């Protein structure tokens, strides 16, 4: 391991291979260390979910989801025992075990916020939708001009969708997905718009789709190697790092220290630019155990040295869920201009259509796999073909809608078991709102308790704010009870319901980003270079100072790329 | 990929790895195909338990596992849901759903069996005990002399000790580990033995254990490389093998047909030598799809051609789980040899003991931890250090006590252990009983339903047979309530019961060998070579004919070993 | 605070209630068997417009409870079956057993 | 709970859970045979299952 390089990112998820991806193919020396390891196969922090067998089994996939997630506070544990056997050993007390945080209030917590240690961050799981933020939901870039605030998000989303592969096609054939599509696009034809969720994706067949992850920002293998012979790369996993080193100035970054979990080495690490791309908590964490912000239970009679704002006006959104069951109304009409004679299952029976039918509700493509399916597999009571791809329907954030919708199905932590109705007829309806930013809402670290790898534990204080918040949240519950009602009826076991605070993973504003560092009340400003120092950026979703309900990490992404041309506007890459 | 090669063999799971090292040593040109893919990291086939970030949070392992296992066969969901709007579609039927299998009789199943579909297999994710079996478990490799029997099976079984790096100190300084063990000697002395289970693993730090899997028996790295110049190897995930093609005269393969499932292309593979280590369930139904055994609903009224007994004397274990708390007599041990001056937490806490006092209860390495811990965390009740290793006690199968047990910690698809007491003092108790294998217990494949991947649906009609197995599964429930309870009271939500059929996964006797087809009712000879077949071998636990309580997997690799032996005598290298 | 709404169900000859000839009860008399579904048409839709309506109205008041979320509940136990022995002018033109004096 | 207990189902067709953890040694079904009351008659899925 070199001890010198250009430039450090700290962290491998699509937001450090964004930096990773700039910088490198810029002609930057670059080390990148992530406190997780390779785990994905031979390509390096790729998608989880691109294997034949999760694909067959996607209901199979929330277990491995569960299975990396781990809790950021879990707080002390008061459930009652009150059966355990006399001669076993029993508390007197409800005592801190099994990793929980006392710092943390059980009643104004983000119970269900968590982090995944792994190469490729999050991205190995998520869901991959990326969609733009519109101006409501975005942070200003440029003041007192829109058009040109408007043209420099444009040029970064769209950079943003390349590095992601972001289409809204490769659903476009699935009856299912149309079904419902075209349904609510008539039921609100001139008040709302409905398209496909823009999706990191490609779709490799009919039955496989190469979900994006951080390996498709960056491919993560070291360099330079013979398809970039002049490039300069290292990744190094299992490797913690704990702390920046400040000058005594607060101008500068000097070092970054590190803890190899394997050997067990702690190191100096110094390059002329330091990243941080942890994630919005650990970003936080880092910068906190580096003398940024205040360690501790907040104090507000005594003022941090610096970064007043780290760790405040916190958002989370809100998240309502609910399954429904497809209306009789919509299967009937999968098969609306077929021709059925005969009973099914003797040699009479027939499905046929007319081809090019002006008066076809359906076009040739979707009558074609309907009368196949009828035809080969008459056992079956569905018009649907068993192989049929998932609906993935949105109506984006609008004034008059302020939520961002998913009308869908995919794997997410909390995904149940259901055996008893056919997937076939099952669609996920999943609202998400904006949560205004209220500095009394905190991400802070214990000057006490520390957490799995010996940092400061993180605690938060945390409620919907009252007002506009609350409003909307439960307005975007309504919403979802009267919008899903066109498509079915409720599910059993996955009645409406909200979900538990965090548990939707799309934090923001743990170190955010604003012009001035005292009026827009920021760590970071419109380059995310941290204010005070010429040499330490913060990138990902902490950085997002405004209220949204859209998903956020294409928006952090496209700050990156901002970030990037700053860097590739300061610093010189080292002659190789 | 090629199209010839002098071996090939179908799975990569530890049995396909065991022929892997033994034939790619021996310079035959060998390829290896699983319908899986690598994702365990870039180690091929390794231990997923192997992350600083699993072995920090074992407890969440257990979510890794229930996501790659794939029930085998799921009878027909008949649960009322009478509960949906009157507008959703409703069902008039139990129809088939969800891949449900129509042939399942319900209550005739092993509802628990599941497999996994990974390179490496199941031992990617399995718990690592591999025990020897006694004479009284296992099968003759020697007719009529029992001594040259027992010689031969030593032999292999140090081989295979040897290939998993089986050991039996890697927890011989865990507190808990000894608390238990020596209480539990104490108590049966004179009349059982208790040991460390032996544990395909190796430990690295006093917090972390490389366990075993395929990789440790075969890397799977294609060869030739720099580290074997001379070797020849090449691994094809996301390859689903389907048939072996028999000649007409049935006496040699002819080639085997596989699907490369990335391409979507179907091949025809030829080699000199074809061996199936596709697991117990599987390996049978790649021979009924190719023609043995009898392909649907059994039917005497029609003697299959080839391998009559292929699918039938199938064996399970069963298995009775609970989880105890640790009894405060046992806890107050743990500190017997302490002196403690004052009061925790206040200035003048102070805890010590003098090394070598005979006096003592304890070694020196088991009070050195507990003070360290005491005097480090004052706050804790308890005196069990915070990273003291798990406990891994077993008794083995004995004529007096007919049943496999294991008292310890371990991830498995059931049994997560929940936060409301301390995991310190937890511990799992497993007992495996023996099942006699009986040809009315069958594993058969449907003539018209597939599965996922388009092969003939596994079908079990399985009841523990009355009689001895029976009798002994429910002793082995008694022996395990009396035993558990001298360690302490049951843990309230793991009180116990049996478990599943089949959850257990040790199935057995799929492809059963034996030395004379028709007087031992068996498909493979003591060679693992099908019967009447010059070129076919079978390897894994469907080999094995006894009734078996201990975990089967060395013992399968003991008879891969000796099938290597036949095939090294009998089959020449190509020229390099 | 509880929100029950309870919709109306059109009358069809195909639902029934009938009695075993074979199989009997408790107290050894006909078991009773049901042959129902809701009735596709007015009354299925008016049932999920009347949840959409519930859901829109207890806003107003709160959201809903954990635990407690909007459900259809058991066909039945709402316990306000009719039409078993039905009144009418008419016991042909009207399909019924009783006259408006409840006399057979 | 007073309600609960002095309202008895009208028809309660034939329970098809499966029990598949019992002892080998108990007595276990080979079929779903009429049980505590239920009904043969009664189709599952055309029931009023709460009326009582
Ligand atoms: C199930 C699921 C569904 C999702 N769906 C979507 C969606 O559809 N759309 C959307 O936009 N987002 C979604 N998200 C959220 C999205 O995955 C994250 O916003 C995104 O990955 C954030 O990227 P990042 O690079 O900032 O952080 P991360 O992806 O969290 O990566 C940060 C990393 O740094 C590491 N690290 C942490 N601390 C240290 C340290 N001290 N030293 C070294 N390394 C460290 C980690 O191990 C990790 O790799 C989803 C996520 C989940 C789990
Ligand atoms: C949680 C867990 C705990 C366990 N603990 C223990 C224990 O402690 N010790 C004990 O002895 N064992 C235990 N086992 C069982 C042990 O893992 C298995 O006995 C062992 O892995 C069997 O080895 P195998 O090579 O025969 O089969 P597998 O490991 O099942 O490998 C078979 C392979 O072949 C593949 N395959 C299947 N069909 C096809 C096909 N048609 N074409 C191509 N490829 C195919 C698979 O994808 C797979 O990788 C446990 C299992 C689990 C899940």
């Known amino acids: 391991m070199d001890i010198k390089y250009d430039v450090v990112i700290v962290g491998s998820g699509?937001?450090?291979?964004?930096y990773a991806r700039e910088l490198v193919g810029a002609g930057y020396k670059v080390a990148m260390f992530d406190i997780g390891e390779i785990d994905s196969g031979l390509k390096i922090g790729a998608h989880k979910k691109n294997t034949?067998?999760?694909?067959?089994?996607?209901?199979?996939?929330?277990?491995?989801?569960?299975?990396?997630?781990?809790?950021?506070?879990?707080?002390?544990?008061?459930?009652?025992?009150?059966?355990?056997?006399?001669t076993s050993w029993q508390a007197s007390t409800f005592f801190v075990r099994n990793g929980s945080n006392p710092e943390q209030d059980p009643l104004r917590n983000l119970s269900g916020q968590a982090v995944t240690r792994v190469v490729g961050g999050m991205s190995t799981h998520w869901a991959c939708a990326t969609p733009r933020f519109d101006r409501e939901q975005r942070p200003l870039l440029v003041k007192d001009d829109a058009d040109?605030?408007?043209?420099?998000?444009?040029?970064?989303?769209?950079?943003?969708?390349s590095y992601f592969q972001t289409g809204t096609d490769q659903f476009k054939e699935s009856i299912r997905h149309n079904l419902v599509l075209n349904k609510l696009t008539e039921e609100y034809?001139?008040?709302?718009?409905?398209?496909?969720?823009?999706?990191?994706?490609?779709?490799?067949?009919?039955?496989?789709?190469?979900?994006?992850?951080?390996?498709?920002?960056?491919?993560?293998?070291?360099?330079?190697?013979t398809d970039a012979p002049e490039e300069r790369f290292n990744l190094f996993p299992a490797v913690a790092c704990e702390r920046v080193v400040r000058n005594a100035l607060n101008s500068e970054i000097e070092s970054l220290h590190i803890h190899?979990?394997?050997?067990?080495?702690?190191?100096?690490?110094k390059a002329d630019v330091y990243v941080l791309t942890a994630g919005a908590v650990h970003n936080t964490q880092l910068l906190v155990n580096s003398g940024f912000g205040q360690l501790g239970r907040p104090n507000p009679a005594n003022p941090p040295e610096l970064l007043p704002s780290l760790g405040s006006y916190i958002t989370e959104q809100s998240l309502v869920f609910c399954q429904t069951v497809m209306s009789t109304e919509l299967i009937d009409s999968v098969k609306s201009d077929m021709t059925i004679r005969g009973t099914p299952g003797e040699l009479t029976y027939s499905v046929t259509y007319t081809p090019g039918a002006s008066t076809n509700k359906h076009p040739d493509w979707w009558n074609e796999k309907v009368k196949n399916h009828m035809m080969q597999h008459q056992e079956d009571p569905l018009p649907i073909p068993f192989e049929?791809?998932?609906?993935?329907?949105?109506?984006?954030?609008?004034?008059?809608?302020?939520?961002?919708?998913?009308?869908?199905?995919?794997?997410?932590?909390?995904?149940?078991?259901?055996?008893?109705?056919?997937?076939?007829?099952?669609?996920?309806?999943?609202?998400?709102?904006?949560?205004?930013?209220?500095?009394?809402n905190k991400l802070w670290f214990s000057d006490k308790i520390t957490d799995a790898y010996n940092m400061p534990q993180p605690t938060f204080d945390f409620r919907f704010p009252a007002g506009r918040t609350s409003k909307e949240a439960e307005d975007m519950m309504t919403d979802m009870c009267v919008m899903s009602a066109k498509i079915g009826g409720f599910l059993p076991g996955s009645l409406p319901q909200f979900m538990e605070?965090?548990?939707?993973?799309?934090?923001?504003?743990?170190?955010?980003?604003?012009?001035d560092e005292k009026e827009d009340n920021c760590?970071?400003?419109?380059?995310?270079?941290?204010?005070?120092?010429?040499?330490?950026?913060?990138?990902?979703?902490?950085?997002?100072?405004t209220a949204y309900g859209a998903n956020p990490t294409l928006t952090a992404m496209s700050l990156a790329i901002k970030s990037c041309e700053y860097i590739k506007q300061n610093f010189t890459p080292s002659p190789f």
């Open 52 to 86: 034949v067998e999760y694909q067959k089994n996607i209901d199979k996939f929330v277990n491995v989801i569960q299975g990396q997630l781990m809790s950021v506070s879990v707080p002390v544990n008061t459930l009652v025992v009150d059966t355990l056997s006399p």
């Open 14 to 18: 699509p937001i450090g291979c964004t």
């Open 523 to 545: 760590c970071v400003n419109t380059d995310s270079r941290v204010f005070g120092f010429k040499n330490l950026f913060l990138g990902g979703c902490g950085n997002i100072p």
């Open 189 to 225: 034809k001139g008040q709302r718009d409905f398209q496909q969720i823009p999706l990191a994706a490609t779709r490799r067949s009919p039955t496989f789709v190469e979900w994006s992850s951080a390996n498709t920002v960056f491919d993560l293998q070291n360099r330079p190697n």
């Open 501 to 515: 605070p965090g548990l939707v993973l799309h934090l923001g504003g743990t170190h955010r980003m604003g012009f």
């Open 148 to 161: 040109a605030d408007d043209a420099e998000w444009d040029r970064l989303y769209t950079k943003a969708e």
């Open 388 to 440: 049929d791809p998932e609906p993935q329907v949105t109506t984006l954030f609008q004034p008059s809608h302020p939520w961002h919708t998913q009308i869908h199905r995919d794997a997410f932590s909390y995904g149940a078991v259901q055996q008893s109705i056919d997937s076939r007829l099952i669609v996920d309806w999943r609202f998400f709102g904006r949560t205004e930013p209220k500095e009394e």
């Open 260 to 269: 190899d979990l394997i050997s067990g080495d702690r190191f100096e690490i």
